[PDB]
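Hey, quick one: can you model this chain's 3D structure?
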Amino acid sequence: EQLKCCSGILKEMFAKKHAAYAWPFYKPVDVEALGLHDYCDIIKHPMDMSTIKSKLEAREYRDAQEFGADVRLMFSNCYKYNPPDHEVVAMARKLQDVFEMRFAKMLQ
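Sure thing. Here's the predicted structure for all 108 residues.
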């Protein structure tokens, strides 16, 4: 199953393989708690790993096509906010390379 296959890749984040890299970027960006009213101005549709995973958690994700669409969309927006020459930037890009490689292997 495509759904079960995707779960395996996501499991890596909590499998002690990419948890440290996705540790500071696991929870969403609470505008009220963090106090970032400017986030809405910079990003019209702010998304996070927790937001995307939450959909899959509630069995909302019927296929990997919808999941990948959100990941690529968020990644593009995240790159805009993520200031170059930063550890967080490298971590995000690294997560994409590992995911793409694994996803490409399971699909191709």
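One thing worth noting: The two ends are 15 Å apart (CA to CA).
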